[PDB]
Design an enzyme around this catalytic site. Structure first.
Site, PDB file in Angstrom:
ATOM      1  N   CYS A   1     -12.237  -8.606   1.854  1.00 49.93           N
ATOM      2  CA  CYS A   1     -11.064  -9.139   1.175  1.00 49.93           C
ATOM      3  C   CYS A   1     -10.136  -7.995   0.773  1.00 49.93           C
ATOM      4  O   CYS A   1     -10.372  -6.825   1.084  1.00 49.93           O
ATOM      5  CB  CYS A   1     -11.489  -9.987  -0.024  1.00 49.93           C
ATOM      6  SG  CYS A   1     -12.100  -9.046  -1.438  1.00 49.93           S
TER       7      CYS A   1
ATOM      8  N   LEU B   1      20.315  -6.454   1.285  1.00 51.99           N
ATOM      9  CA  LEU B   1      20.918  -7.013   2.490  1.00 51.99           C
ATOM     10  C   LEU B   1      21.119  -5.982   3.600  1.00 51.99           C
ATOM     11  O   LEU B   1      21.999  -6.161   4.452  1.00 51.99           O
ATOM     12  CB  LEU B   1      22.242  -7.702   2.143  1.00 51.99           C
ATOM     13  CG  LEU B   1      23.201  -7.037   1.149  1.00 51.99           C
ATOM     14  CD1 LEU B   1      23.994  -5.913   1.795  1.00 51.99           C
ATOM     15  CD2 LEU B   1      24.137  -8.066   0.535  1.00 51.99           C
TER      16      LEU B   1
ATOM     17  N   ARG C   1       0.319  -5.073  -6.580  1.00 52.54           N
ATOM     18  CA  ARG C   1      -1.086  -5.410  -6.377  1.00 52.54           C
ATOM     19  C   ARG C   1      -1.526  -6.588  -7.236  1.00 52.54           C
ATOM     20  O   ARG C   1      -2.389  -7.366  -6.814  1.00 52.54           O
ATOM     21  CB  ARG C   1      -1.965  -4.195  -6.673  1.00 52.54           C
ATOM     22  CG  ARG C   1      -2.053  -3.186  -5.540  1.00 52.54           C
ATOM     23  CD  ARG C   1      -2.818  -1.935  -5.960  1.00 52.54           C
ATOM     24  NE  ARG C   1      -4.050  -2.246  -6.682  1.00 52.54           N
ATOM     25  CZ  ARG C   1      -4.209  -2.088  -7.993  1.00 52.54           C
ATOM     26  NH1 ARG C   1      -3.213  -1.618  -8.733  1.00 52.54           N
ATOM     27  NH2 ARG C   1      -5.365  -2.398  -8.566  1.00 52.54           N
TER      28      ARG C   1
ATOM     29  N   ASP D   1       4.851  -6.840  -2.912  1.00 53.68           N
ATOM     30  CA  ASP D   1       4.690  -5.399  -3.022  1.00 53.68           C
ATOM     31  C   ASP D   1       3.763  -4.945  -4.140  1.00 53.68           C
ATOM     32  O   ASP D   1       3.246  -3.826  -4.061  1.00 53.68           O
ATOM     33  CB  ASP D   1       6.057  -4.721  -3.218  1.00 53.68           C
ATOM     34  CG  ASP D   1       6.977  -4.905  -2.026  1.00 53.68           C
ATOM     35  OD1 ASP D   1       6.467  -5.012  -0.890  1.00 53.68           O
ATOM     36  OD2 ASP D   1       8.211  -4.939  -2.223  1.00 53.68           O
TER      37      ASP D   1
ATOM     38  N   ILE E   1       4.109 -17.036  -7.724  1.00 58.79           N
ATOM     39  CA  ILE E   1       2.844 -17.482  -7.151  1.00 58.79           C
ATOM     40  C   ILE E   1       1.713 -17.396  -8.169  1.00 58.79           C
ATOM     41  O   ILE E   1       0.658 -18.011  -7.976  1.00 58.79           O
ATOM     42  CB  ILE E   1       2.516 -16.668  -5.883  1.00 58.79           C
ATOM     43  CG1 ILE E   1       1.432 -17.363  -5.054  1.00 58.79           C
ATOM     44  CG2 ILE E   1       2.090 -15.256  -6.248  1.00 58.79           C
ATOM     45  CD1 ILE E   1       1.803 -18.760  -4.607  1.00 58.79           C
TER      46      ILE E   1
ATOM     47  N   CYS F   1      -0.205  12.304 -25.055  1.00 59.20           N
ATOM     48  CA  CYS F   1      -0.211  13.684 -25.528  1.00 59.20           C
ATOM     49  C   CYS F   1       0.497  14.615 -24.553  1.00 59.20           C
ATOM     50  O   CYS F   1       0.992  15.673 -24.955  1.00 59.20           O
ATOM     51  CB  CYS F   1      -1.645  14.154 -25.764  1.00 59.20           C
ATOM     52  SG  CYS F   1      -2.557  13.185 -26.989  1.00 59.20           S
TER      53      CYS F   1
ATOM     54  N   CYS G   1     -15.378 -10.772  -3.977  1.00 56.68           N
ATOM     55  CA  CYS G   1     -15.856 -11.687  -2.948  1.00 56.68           C
ATOM     56  C   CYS G   1     -17.364 -11.613  -2.726  1.00 56.68           C
ATOM     57  O   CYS G   1     -17.867 -12.224  -1.779  1.00 56.68           O
ATOM     58  CB  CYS G   1     -15.125 -11.423  -1.628  1.00 56.68           C
ATOM     59  SG  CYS G   1     -15.483  -9.819  -0.871  1.00 56.68           S
TER      60      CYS G   1
END
Ligand SMILES: [Zn+2]
EC number: 2.3.2.-
Lengths: 506, 312
Positions: free
Chosen positions: A155, A54, A116, A114, A93, A170, A402
């Site tokens: 895209c 906020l 990917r 945010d 989504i 390791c 694409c």
């Protein structure tokens, strides 16, 4: 609102638009959309309001801490303009209910996320639906806006976005050289004790190290007692590291600790070793209460904003940091490295959101030719341009998303990698498919992975070589949710490393 | 020494401009006139920024010509004061910022009224008001800002006098010097020289667009409206002739079709300019990053954000 070219103002008041995410850019975007004339808006976000949000997401207040970012945003906008048809989705989504038919309802889709993985999905959904996508992202003083339309521009995945660092096991638990390696170990430690038992996140010393020659079952049998888990994790596991003398010829590996030894002798201040051992005990007792409410072996998802979860990772990473002779860092300093906190301010979100609607107005005007990629810099470039615009690039002919017939080549060990590894870590994680369908190119259509539940669970444990998969085997990966088809060429290689399972040629 | 409620609220921005620069911002009070399309944007991300107080001043009353152009005004506030109708909404953005409201117009304010403000931001004011306030602010070492919005275009001006900030690169901490000039010298430039003519080709046309619009707000007590476009353009199409020649400049330096992209308050143009202008106020009160010297012209059509320095 009323003052716009009449064909443009008619397309805004009637057209339907989609906002993916009510985060930083999400709140500023809803405002600029409504004050422009957009009355048919769909907002979808899964996160909830936190007190740290906020300061830049003005549609939320201290009253709404705990509620969902999507429900409160719909309530907050109906105050200054009640005649706004806004649909709020408290969902992800990535849910398959939001198919290509759902995306094709909108004349414009705008990103406000945010991570990917979800952006790759929304990218592939807007291509299949052939609806323009306005991708946006902010980071401190910087921000970017671009337009994505199938067959016109490149895209979201035409160019590889910069990937974060990944350190091998390791190096994490056998030779941690940087303070970040202790934070990953603490995030590993929180997962083994009070989270989902992960395989690659082992905190115990690794015995199969090339430079060389259950923890939760014990954690649950110990009773999650703070005094006992301290000595086993900070001295015994370090003494089994002293069992292996080969690593310690190069650098110094002192020193093991002891609960009875060190405990007796503003988050920006670095505390001593005696204090972080107390917060480690306090965290286990507080997280034991958060785990007692849950039942049937329910796990705890780590949150950077959760105090008890943050107190554990900070104290555990600092104690191990002091163990491996590394100079301890602060709690405020580690919260930025633990949860990947991106510093964001209200001004940067407001400027970017204003550029989104400006680009959206050019899309709805048919002026897709005039659309630009706009960079918000911190200082003016030699062209005196603080906001640097540039033309959109044509689609990449070698993109794996694409392009006409996308076709990747994966190098892996056929006799080692299981089909479950092919499903999760390869097709769903690296290639960002939601519900994948993978078959073998061999005439018969050997089904490897099916979209429906458990149709191929009898194959997950099986190795790829058990299906005749060989060097050069072609797999046809299909994600009908994204309307995306990818051909995966298989190359058999046994010289990769025991921590590397596969790699893409590129 | 901030409380714990302020640490969690401003957590994401303390990790951006530090704690010391936030404490400098906590003890600042800003004066903002022109509570409208651009003023509401500036007031929003300033109260969220974490200043101590913000005084919203506007003499004009809520005209029924901005139905949704301002979000601080709830529906049905026509006839009420624009600053009073924006109080309750702006106060809820941050309870730790006492948002004050003034009703008297900015012209009839004495010099002693501005002394209580560490910074002043003007909006929707005539040229004479902008020069009057900047001269008062420069007299008392008060940071002066101004800006407006016209269609797809926008501008911001800043005058900080002798302003020393602190940047850093490597971690480090570096002090620099940047000297601004009063707005009266930045609006009347001697465009007759070997340097002036050579630097004019590199200057954006929005500056001369700003001159034409300030002259319009001077001749008539309002900016051009969409309803009067029918021959407010012809007055604009003649101010561009009667002003650009007064400075000794070619008339068609500013394009002729400008009378179609600078005619209203567009909410996206308010958020872009308001976000940049308010950010210049934050970095000035904190004396941290180097501020833009001294103009910033925005073109929402081409997507240009050009920072000009036209003082001397
Ligand atoms: Zn692509």
């Amino acid at each position: 609102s009323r003052g716009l070219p009449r064909e443009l103002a008619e397309a805004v008041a009637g057209g339907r638009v989609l906002v993916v995410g009510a985060g930083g850019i999400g709140c500023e975007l809803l405002k600029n959309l409504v004050l422009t004339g957009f009355s048919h808006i769909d907002l979808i976000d899964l996160d909830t309001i936190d007190v740290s949000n906020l300061n830049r997401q003005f549609l939320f207040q201290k009253k709404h801490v705990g509620r969902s970012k999507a429900q409160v945003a719909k309530e907050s906008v109906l105050q200054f303009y009640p005649k706004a048809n806004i649909v709020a989705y408290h969902d992800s989504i990535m849910n398959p209910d939001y198919n290509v038919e759902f995306f094709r309802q909108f004349i414009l889709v705008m990103n406000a996320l945010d991570n990917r993985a979800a952006r790759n999905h929304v990218n592939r959904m807007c291509l299949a639906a052939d609806v323009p996508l306005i991708e946006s992202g902010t980071a401190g003083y910087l921000g970017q806006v671009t337009t994505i339309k199938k067959g016109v521009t490149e895209c979201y995945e035409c160019h590889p976005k910069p990937t974060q660092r990944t350190f091998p096991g390791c190096t994490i638990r056998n030779t941690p050289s940087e303070p970040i390696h202790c934070i990953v170990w603490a995030k590993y430690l929180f997962n083994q004790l009070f989270g989902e038992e992960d395989a690659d996140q082992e905190v115990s010393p690794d015995r199969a190290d090339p430079e060389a020659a259950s923890t939760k079952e014990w954690a649950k049998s110990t009773g999650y007692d703070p005094v006992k888990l301290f000595t086993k994790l900070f001295k015994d596991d370090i003494r089994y590291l002293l069992t292996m003398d080969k690593l310690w010829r190069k650098r110094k590996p002192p020193v093991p600790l002891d609960w009875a030894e060190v405990q007796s002798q503003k988050d920006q201040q670095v505390l001593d070793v005696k204090s972080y051992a107390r917060l480690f005990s306090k965290s286990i007792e507080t997280l034991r209460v958060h785990l007692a409410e849950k039942g049937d072996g329910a796990e705890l998802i780590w949150d950077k904003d959760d105090p008890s979860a943050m107190d554990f990772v900070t104290s555990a990473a600092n104690l191990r940091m002091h163990i491996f002779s590394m100079n301890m860092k602060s709690r405020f300093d580690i919260k930025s490295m633990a949860g990947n906190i991106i510093p964001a301010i209200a001004t940067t979100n407001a400027v970017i959101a204003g550029l989104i609607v400006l680009e959206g107005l050019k899309i709805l005007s048919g002026k897709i030719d005039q659309c630009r990629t706009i960079f918000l810099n911190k200082q003016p470039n030699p062209r005196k341009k603080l906001l640097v615009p540039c033309a959109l690039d044509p689609p990449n002919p070698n993109c794996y998303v694409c392009a006409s017939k996308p076709e990747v080549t994966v190098r892996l060990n056929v006799h080692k990698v299981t089909v479950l590894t092919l499903q999760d870590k390869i097709v769903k994680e690296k290639f960002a498919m939601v519900a994948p369908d993978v078959q073998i190119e061999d005439g018969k259509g050997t089904i490897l992975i099916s979209s429906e539940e458990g149709e191929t669970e009898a194959n997950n444990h099986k190795k790829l070589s058990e299906f005749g998969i060989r060097n050069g085997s072609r797999l046809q990966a299909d994600d009908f949710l994204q309307d995306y088809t990818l051909l995966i060429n298989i190359l058999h290689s046994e010289d990769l490393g025991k921590d590397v399972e596969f790699e893409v040629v590129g | 020494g901030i409380s714990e409620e302020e640490a969690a609220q401003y957590d994401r921005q303390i990790r951006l401009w530090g704690l010391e620069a936030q404490k400098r911002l906590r003890a600042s009070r800003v004066l903002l006139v022109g509570l409208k399309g651009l003023g509401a944007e500036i007031a929003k991300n300033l109260i969220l920024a974490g200043v101590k107080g913000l005084t919203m001043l506007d003499h004009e009353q809520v005209t029924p010509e901005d139905p949704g152009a301002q979000f601080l005004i709830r529906t049905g506030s026509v006839g009420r004061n624009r600053a009073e109708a924006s109080l309750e909404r702006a106060q809820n953005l941050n309870p730790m910022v006492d948002v004050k409201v003034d009703t008297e117009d900015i012209e009839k304010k004495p010099e002693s009224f501005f002394t209580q403000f560490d910074a002043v931001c003007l909006t929707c004011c005539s040229r004479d008001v902008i020069v009057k306030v900047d001269q008062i602010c420069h007299k008392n070492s008060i940071k002066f800002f101004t800006g407006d919005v016209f269609g797809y275009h926008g501008y911001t001006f800043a005058n900080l006098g002798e302003h020393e900030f602190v940047e850093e690169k490597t971690t480090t901490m570096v002090k620099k010097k940047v000297v601004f000039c009063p707005v009266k010298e930045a609006l009347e430039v001697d465009w007759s020289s070997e340097k002036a003519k050579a630097a004019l080709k590199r200057t954006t046309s929005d500056y001369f667009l700003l001159q034409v619009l300030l002259k319009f707000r001077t001749d008539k007590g309002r900016d051009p409206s969409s309803d009067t476009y029918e021959e407010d353009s012809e007055l604009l199409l003649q101010i561009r002739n009667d002003v650009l020649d007064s400075l000794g400049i070619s008339p068609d330096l500013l394009p002729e079709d400008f009378v179609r992209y600078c005619f209203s308050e567009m909410a996206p143009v308010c958020a872009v300019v308001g976000g940049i202008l308010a950010q210049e106020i934050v970095k000035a009160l904190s004396q941290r990053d180097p501020p833009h010297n001294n103009f910033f012209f925005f073109d929402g059509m081409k997507g240009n954000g050009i920072v000009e320095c036209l003082g001397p």
